[PDB]
């Protein structure tokens, strides 16, 4: 399936800034409800399960930046769409993905 409005999407992600790996992990989210940092779900829009790609979010637009992240820097995400599925009644009711 394609990432779209009201789908529950599972991604694997790696966060780098200027070539330095800062974080890695996996998450699930309900698409179309501003649940991720600005720019990331827009990069995910329309993608199929199994797609791997990069997304770039200005660090300013996320609340994380007293750090190793320079101001005006870019957050480079390497993202892989692991699974896309229909949301359950619970998930649609609350606007968030559930385990």
């Amino acid at each position: 399936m394609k990432v779209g409005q009201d789908k529950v999407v599972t991604i694997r992600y790696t966060l780098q800034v200027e070539g330095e790996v800062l974080d890695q992990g996996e998450l699930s989210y309900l698409h179309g409800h501003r649940n991720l940092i600005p720019g990331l779900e827009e990069a995910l829009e329309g993608r199929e399960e199994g797609e791997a790609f990069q997304a770039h979010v200005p660090a300013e637009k996320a609340y994380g930046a007293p750090g190793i992240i320079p101001p005006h820097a870019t957050l480079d995400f390497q993202v892989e769409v692991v699974k896309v599925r229909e949301a359950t009644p619970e998930e649609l009711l609350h606007g968030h993905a559930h385990p």
Binding site: L15, N35, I37, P38, Y63, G64, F77
Partner: peptide, 14 residues
């Protein structure tokens, strides 16, 4: 590595 000031990332803040 996650830290307090960026704990939600890449989920939206708040």
């Amino acid at each position: 590595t996650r830290y307090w000031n960026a704990k939600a990332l890449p989920f939206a803040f708040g």
